[PDB]
């Protein structure tokens, strides 16, 4: 009721990925993707991502907040999050990890995913059988010279 609309996937960096999580409490998607790595790809998972954004705006909630990350720039985010998969959609929350999803997904699997570790919808069939684990997030060493 407070709030229907909510902003789009925003390119998020190193300097402002501290804040993006441990400022940031609330439920926030980390979209690991690479310019070099599958490339096309890229484009199919924030295809989905956005959509699946979408999609929870109807179920009568305030979806969280989508943020996607460079690989190729940002190098040092990558490497504390030992991403080794691209892209790669971190279902992160109160600057902690929770879910790792590696591999193409539509919006609306995916939208049961995270909403499943954050709204505590209801959990599909790809992730039933899938890997998940909880590990606290890495923060980045940021320095403004």
């Given at each position: 009721?407070?709030?229907?609309?909510?902003?789009?996937?925003?390119?998020?960096?190193?300097?402002?990925?501290?804040?993006?999580?441990?400022?940031?409490?609330?439920?926030?998607?980390?979209?690991?993707?690479?310019?070099?790595?599958?490339?096309?790809?890229?484009?199919?998972?924030?295809?989905?991502?956005?959509?699946?954004?979408?999609?929870?705006?109807n179920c009568g909630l305030p979806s969280p907040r989508c943020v996607a990350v460079d690989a190729v720039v940002e190098?040092?985010?990558?490497?504390?999050?030992?991403?080794?998969?691209?892209?790669?959609?971190?279902?992160?929350?109160?600057?902690?990890?929770?879910?790792?999803?590696?591999?193409?997904?539509?919006?609306?699997?995916?939208?049961?995913?995270?909403?499943?570790?954050?709204?505590?919808?209801?959990?599909?069939?790809?992730?039933?059988?899938?890997?998940?684990?909880?590990?606290?997030?890495?923060?980045?060493?940021?320095?403004?010279?």
């Amino acid at each position: 009721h407070m709030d229907n609309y909510i902003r789009p996937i925003k390119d998020l960096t190193t300097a402002e990925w501290e804040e993006a999580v441990f400022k940031d409490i609330s439920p926030l998607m980390v979209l690991v993707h690479n310019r070099y790595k599958r490339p096309k790809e890229n484009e199919k998972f924030r295809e989905e991502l956005e959509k699946a954004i979408q999609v929870i705006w109807n179920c009568g909630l305030p979806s969280p907040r989508c943020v996607a990350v460079d690989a190729v720039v940002e190098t040092d985010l990558v490497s504390a999050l030992k991403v080794s998969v691209f892209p790669e959609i971190i279902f992160t929350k109160a600057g902690k990890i929770l879910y790792r999803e590696k591999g193409i997904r539509t919006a609306d699997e995916l939208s049961k995913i995270m909403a499943f570790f954050y709204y505590g919808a209801a959990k599909p069939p790809c992730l039933n059988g899938v890997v998940n684990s909880q590990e606290q997030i890495p923060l980045v060493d940021v320095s403004v010279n």
